[PDB]
Design a binder for this molecule. Structure first.
Ligand code: HEC
Ligand code: HEC
Ligand code: HEC
Ligand code: HEC
Ligand code: HEC
Ligand code: HEC
Ligand code: HEC
Ligand code: HEC
Ligand code: HEC
Ligand code: HEC
Ligand code: HEC
Ligand code: HEC
Ligand code: HEC
Ligand code: HEC
Ligand SMILES: O=N[O-]
Ligand SMILES: O=N[O-]
Ligand SMILES: [Ca+2]
Ligand SMILES: [Ca+2]
Ligand SMILES: [Ca+2]
Ligand SMILES: [Ca+2]
Lengths: 519, 519, 104, 103
């Protein structure tokens, strides 16, 4: 059984924690619930850590007193189809292989599934670690509770004796790097300096061997990613988000200065040997839009190239950990601002961006966002009970599973079937424009080899490559984003019509040039 | 927000609490969660209380860290039909009014419903307070969460300016007294001496004005009735049960000395100044058979009469708070031992016992009890989750709502429909014998006025009255007991056949005597 | 509330409508249910319309006496997927864009 | 629901690798007329035809087999990755040869 420690003894050194812990709703929660610090207390000084205390990061540390929220979080939605490849006729992006050729996502890009699996899915996907990590057997794919307990309880490593990234199966890639892990776990929260910069006090950084880093990590989406464990108050911990909102002064709602002030973030920094080490962002309100934007954003978490001169931008560069914090129509300017692109297309040779699930940036300025609605209202609402103490659902999933609470409470004029029909109208329309954008992108891409072999000039091909950047951006945003237009239907429509317009311009350019060479 | 108190300072006086709190699973749970002792600490010495500290008895004091158990407890089972009178052709005892005439239960005796309602249902039933207390309106009957928050949030008092028991509606009775309340609430745990004996430190006792006592009570079935708040270990608090098991040396299982030793109870007494005041019984194991037997037993909680001379036994007498802790075939001897009966039948004049829900004493010696099965296995089993932290359901209800966990886990040879069929076979058979027992009891009762009017002698009428005692006991045990024979089908069968045998003997005696007088 | 008009006055000019209306199952259904023709009657000649009467074409003009048929007609089948593009792999014509290129 | 989810995990993964194998086979097949019309030698075309045998075998086994990988998921994965590897080798061969003829 746990025995309480004297928190006042801790507070003699730890004044920042004292200020947070004594004032919030965890003021009676003893340190022993999360820390084993006996040898630390015996050896520390005011400035030196001495022996390192143990800090629990397992979700079960919170489950003892908050079983309802924990059980809700670890639920597996079996209807969220698992390991479902997006590059197939029946999924999100039928022509993805042709359009993304030259990028690691071509090796595998499945649809998302329940949060319990995020860290194991990162480790096992074919594009990440060359197939090094696998489930112990095919039965383990169901075990959300096991994944939560720890990744290495359900996975194997093909070669525990080496730590290099290499292919163990032929059709895999080795795209993973330490920055990726910040959106899968925060087990490394005390071992990683802000932004992943080199630091004397950091075990891990942007330049670490990712296989060794992986082996040190266990838990998905720790409870403390949104809740400070000392104050119990709302926060974010993700460095790139704090960098965009606070360091670069963009605010929590870059399109709305007033909302940014009412619903802002305060950066708190913790030091090692009196040098800045790590940081968190305390929130003015319990604002899920900003909590969820720790991960559901467009980002850099990878090496790339400069638009200016084509030169390599490696993991050592700050640009390898970056939140653009820009909507689709501001993105090109944002990428030019840091002089960066992701890959060169394998067929066209065009410099292209790679887009990541931009739900937060897409939600800005939408009808629901402008009306004060937030991600949690639709995806993790309050539970309704005939008799019982209300709590917030932590099962982040589609509103279709809870339409009464997610939609119909605001939309009294609708039945459930009417609300679903409204969602499907938008998704069906948006998906048709994604498919049409792919048709025109593919038509343009296929003309590049014909043009090159016909002797079309580099000047004309380069003009077409410049159009490919825009045609790609204004399409891929929408296959990357998970709502199939629902989060901002008018923006999706304008963007996809732009993609098609750009591809058509490029098709006309190339066909005319081919025809002139032939004549 | 709560601010923790210095528990070590409390322990300078409170060594008995220290020895419990420091060792169990609530060692890190600060006193401020349940006590407001600021003025107490300012004024006390180790030998003088000073200002009385406040103690919380509300269930929300526990719900804060144990929401899953609380929410399960407060659930209302709408299929448990409410306010359903037992004295009707479609319920448990069709001829109850004829058989029970002379007793307060004739005014109203409904089937039980969900635990959330126990204190409000006690206050509003027609037999208890002369109709003084009612729900604020007829809508409030659904409000389990409100009842748990407090009886007086959902009830009204017809006359707040008087405290006497009287009739406010014509067909009511005033049977309630302070002993009743010990099986509805333990809000008074610090205000009631062991057994409800008179005590200088007790606000309330067996002889209190029950209307005044009622007004001071709020919460049903407090969480601490089965769980010590300081150690978190398993216990009982009900005085009558501790008295039977420990003081009278009967043991937790009177028919099994080995099981009584393995699964025993330790009486712990708490003093006020130099004097013993209150007590609890700490359990060796988390034994729900004994936890539920705090209430689901046959008891005295009322005035009565002596079998020896017919003299009144009032609330002042220790016999007014008594657990017989005896099976149906040992009951008559247990009542003779204390020289007690409940009422004189309105028609026959016979001295009779009144039986109360004897589930615990019925369960003894049954096949399931002999195999180490306990109440919780069928009525509050562990929850089964595909992914999640297991906890124990606290919704104490029929196994029919959870047959997978409550029966089929042990009975793999059966489908749900087969298990239900086996339960119904027993209940149908038992109920047929209850109805036959009532037929023969009513036939006997109806002969008494005929016999008296025909000039049958008092010696013969007295012989028939002695038979009425047994015919009554061996029938009413089973209408009082809630399983309709399921908890012990062979015992129900043997007892009900005995009831019918006794009634037939009395019918023959009376018919022969009537016929001889005529013739 | 509607007030009936003298249909025989209308029929003095409108012999084609008379032949149809007097014989079928709407012979008792007054013109006012669908037409507002007061100024028309005051200004028309046998050959010239005069002021144009109002003619109701809303479906609710029939719904007053035939609510069952109207309610059946306006039902929305939510299972008939809305705004679903045919030129996609999961619909009627996966290669429609290539095959129909040049058409709106 | 857990057992069905386990089946669907394997079928979904296998089907994605069948679709990717078809993408690479189709890409190789479409280069044959371009190569022939560009004057690529019979020797190079015959090398590509030898690769086509393997690319075809290690794909078609899985469209022919009815379990979409469930009957032997590790074998399906190894085979389909081989198909894709063979098609990629053939695509590279043909593209390089076409490009040399054009230059
Ligand atoms: C002064 C002698 C201290 C005592 C008393 C306690 N801690 Fe400490 N701790 C101290 C220092 C100088 C540092 C390095 C960071 C800094 O503020 O300069 C720490 C660090 C920690 C940490 C972080 C460990 C990590 O892996 O990075 C934790 C979780 C921590 N300390 C906990 C802790 C507890 C629970 C204490 C009371 C039991 C306690 N510390 C006392 C200095 C001192
Ligand atoms: C779980 C409910 C915890 C409670 C109770 C306590 N701590 Fe904590 N602590 C916890 C976590 C998950 C972390 C990682 C960092 C994060 O922000 O989530 C920490 C960290 C610390 C640190 C390090 C701060 C730094 O310099 O980086 C310290 C010094 C610390 N914790 C102290 C501390 C004290 C003294 C506590 C009792 C009053 C205490 N913590 C409780 C989790 C939890
Ligand atoms: C028992 C020893 C606890 C541990 C372990 C954890 N929490 Fe907690 N939490 C606890 C209490 C008694 C309360 C106050 C309840 C009340 O409403 O009065 C809380 C509260 C929270 C909250 C709400 C905070 C707020 O609204 O301001 C959150 C978000 C929360 N707790 C989170 C949380 C986390 C993430 C934990 C693991 C790191 C955790 N709690 C542990 C008691 C206990
Ligand atoms: C008994 C006759 C079984 C039948 C019927 C089914 N399964 Fe099975 N399965 C069985 C065993 C003994 C094992 C090996 C497990 C062990 O003991 O180590 C398995 C394994 C699986 C797996 C993992 C396969 C892998 O390649 O790693 C899966 C995904 C699985 N089983 C699923 C499954 C399904 C869906 C079934 C019904 C169609 C099924 N099994 C039946 C034993 C038996
Ligand atoms: C936060 C800005 C993230 C970064 C950095 C990485 N990922 Fe990610 N990932 C993130 C979200 C919000 C989601 C769910 C939404 C979605 O569109 O999928 C994911 C999902 C994955 C998955 C599962 C789906 C799939 O693509 O197969 C995997 C396997 C995955 N992510 C891997 C991965 C890699 C290898 C990363 C570094 C190169 C990486 N992620 C970074 C959020 C973020
Ligand atoms: C961000 C992605 C979150 C993660 C990770 C966790 N929680 Fe959470 N929590 C989140 C929100 C948006 C809210 C509602 C806040 C509001 O006021 O609208 C909560 C709330 C809680 C609470 C408070 C009680 C309640 O409303 O249910 C608790 C005690 C809590 N959360 C606990 C908790 C646990 C145990 C987690 C890991 C299993 C966890 N939270 C993660 C957002 C996020
Ligand atoms: C209601 C007004 C919503 C708000 C606020 C947010 N989302 Fe949403 N989301 C919504 C719908 C109707 C859908 C389509 C769901 C369907 O079943 O068709 C989505 C979808 C997503 C998804 C994919 C979910 C899935 O299909 O399983 C994700 C990952 C998602 N949404 C994330 C998300 C974020 C991060 C939000 C705040 C920035 C957000 N959503 C708000 C409806 C609503
Ligand atoms: C010695 C100076 C004491 C200190 C320090 C604390 N308590 Fe106390 N307490 C003390 C006495 C002499 C008594 C009366 C004992 C008797 O003979 O009757 C008490 C009583 C209580 C009670 C019970 C009150 C009741 O309703 O009967 C409680 C709940 C209690 N005390 C709590 C308590 C707390 C939480 C303390 C630390 C904050 C604390 N006490 C300190 C003597 C002394
Ligand atoms: C948070 C501040 C708590 C309050 C308020 C209550 N309980 Fe508690 N309880 C708490 C913890 C951290 C634990 C240990 C969890 C673990 O398994 O480590 C417990 C444990 C219990 C138990 C189980 C005890 C055992 O198995 O030995 C019970 C029965 C229990 N708690 C009951 C209970 C009651 C009745 C409360 C109101 C009087 C109560 N708890 C409040 C945390 C907290
Ligand atoms: C609007 C036209 C109503 C209809 C339809 C139903 N109820 Fe009603 N009910 C309504 C009002 C305005 C009130 C009084 C609330 C107040 O101001 O106090 C009620 C009351 C009840 C009650 C309590 C009756 C009592 O004597 O205390 C019950 C049990 C009740 N309502 C139930 C009920 C049922 C079951 C209905 C469908 C048959 C129903 N109501 C319809 C308003 C309206
Ligand atoms: C513990 C030994 C009890 C005593 C003392 C009293 N009651 Fe009771 N009561 C008890 C149980 C286990 C149950 C549920 C099982 C059942 O057979 O009903 C009840 C139920 C009630 C009810 C609801 C059902 C009904 O009879 O209408 C009421 C209204 C009620 N009890 C009242 C009551 C009175 C007035 C008491 C003192 C004379 C009394 N109870 C004492 C357990 C115990
Ligand atoms: C006796 C009638 C009980 C009442 C009143 C309460 N609980 Fe309980 N609890 C009871 C049993 C038989 C058990 C299981 C013991 C076993 O080991 O088999 C429990 C268990 C708990 C626990 C431990 C965790 C778990 O198993 O769920 C906790 C934290 C707990 N109970 C809390 C709790 C609360 C909050 C109550 C009031 C709402 C409550 N218990 C009342 C029996 C009884
Ligand atoms: C002779 C003086 C007429 C009288 C009496 C009525 N109508 Fe007439 N109408 C008349 C003419 C010459 C025309 C033009 C068409 C033709 O037959 O030559 C009309 C036209 C109409 C129409 C059609 C209007 C339109 O928008 O096209 C309607 C609906 C109509 N008339 C209705 C109508 C009614 C209901 C009358 C009795 C109240 C009526 N008309 C009398 C000539 C004459
Ligand atoms: C009431 C004032 C009516 C108005 C307005 C409309 N209709 Fe009607 N209709 C009416 C009657 C009394 C009848 C006869 C019912 C019977 O079976 O005896 C009808 C009939 C029809 C029919 C059936 C005709 C047939 O089978 O021969 C149809 C198709 C019909 N009515 C259509 C209809 C239309 C389309 C209307 C709006 C332009 C309309 N009716 C109005 C009474 C009334
Ligand atoms: O990309 N995840
Ligand atoms: N209780 O009767
Ligand atoms: Ca999904
Ligand atoms: Ca990107
Ligand atoms: Ca019942
Ligand atoms: Ca009794």
């Amino acid at each position: 059984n746990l025995k309480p420690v004297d928190a006042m003894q801790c507070f003699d050194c730890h004044t920042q924690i004292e200020d947070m812990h004594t004032v919030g709703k965890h003021a009676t929660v003893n340190c022993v619930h999360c820390h084993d610090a006996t040898e630390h207390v015996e050896t520390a000084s005011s400035r030196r850590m001495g022996e390192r205390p143990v800090t629990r990061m397992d979700l079960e540390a919170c489950a003892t007193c908050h079983t309802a929220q924990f059980n809700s979080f670890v639920e597996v939605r079996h209807e969220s189809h698992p390991r479902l490849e997006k590059a197939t006729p029946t999924s999100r992006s039928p022509m993805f292989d042709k359009l993304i050729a030259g990028h690691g996502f071509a090796f595998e890009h499945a649809e998302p599934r329940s949060h319990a699996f995020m860290l194991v899915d990162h480790f096992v996907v074919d594009r990440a670690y060359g197939g090094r990590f696998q489930f112990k057997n095919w039965q383990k794919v169901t075990d959300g509770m096991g994944a939560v307990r720890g990744a290495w309880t359900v996975l194997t490593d093909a070669d525990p004796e080496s730590s290099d990234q290499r292919r163990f199966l032929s059709q895999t890639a080795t795209a993973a790097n330490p920055v990726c892990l910040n959106c899968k776990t925060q087990d490394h929260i005390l071992d990683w300096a802000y932004m992943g910069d080199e630091h004397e006090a950091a075990k891990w950084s942007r330049t670490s061997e990712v296989v060794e880093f992986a082996r040190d990590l266990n838990h998905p989406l720790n409870c403390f990613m949104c809740h400070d464990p000392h104050s119990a108050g709302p926060r974010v911990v993700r460095d790139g988000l704090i960098n965009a909102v606070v360091d670069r002064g963009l605010g929590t709602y870059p399109h709305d200065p007033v909302k940014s002030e009412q619903q802002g973030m305060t950066k708190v920094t913790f030091q090692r040997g009196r040098e800045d080490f790590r940081a968190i962002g305390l929130l003015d309100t319990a604002d899920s839009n900003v909590m969820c934007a720790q991960c559901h954003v467009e980002y850099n978490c990878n090496p790339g190239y400069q638009l200016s001169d084509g030169s390599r931008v490696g993991m050592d560069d700050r640009r390898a950990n970056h939140f653009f914090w820009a909507n689709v129509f501001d993105y090109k300017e944002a990428a030019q601002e840091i002089d960066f692109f992701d890959f060169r297309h394998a067929t066209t040779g065009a410099a292209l961006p790679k887009l990541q699930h931009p739900e937060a940036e897409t939600f800005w300025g939408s009808v629901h966002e402008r009306n004060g609605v937030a991600c949690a209202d639709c995806h993790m609402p309050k539970v309704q009970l005939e008799n019982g103490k209300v709590y917030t659902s932590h099962s982040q999933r589609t509103p279709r599973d809870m339409m009464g609470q997610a939609c119909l409470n605001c939309h009294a004029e609708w039945t459930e079937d009417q609300a679903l029909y409204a969602i499907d109208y938008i998704k069906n329309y948006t998906h048709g424009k994604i498919v049409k954008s792919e048709y025109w992108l593919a038509k343009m891409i296929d003309l590049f080899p014909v043009a090159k072999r016909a002797g079309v000039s580099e000047d004309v091909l380069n003009q077409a490559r410049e159009l490919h950047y825009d045609a790609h951006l204004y399409w891929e945003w929408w296959t990357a984003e998970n709502s199939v237009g629902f989060h901002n239907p008018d923006q999706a429509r304008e963007s996809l019509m732009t993609s098609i317009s750009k591809s058509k311009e490029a098709v006309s350019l190339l066909n005319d040039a081919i025809d002139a060479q032939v004549a």
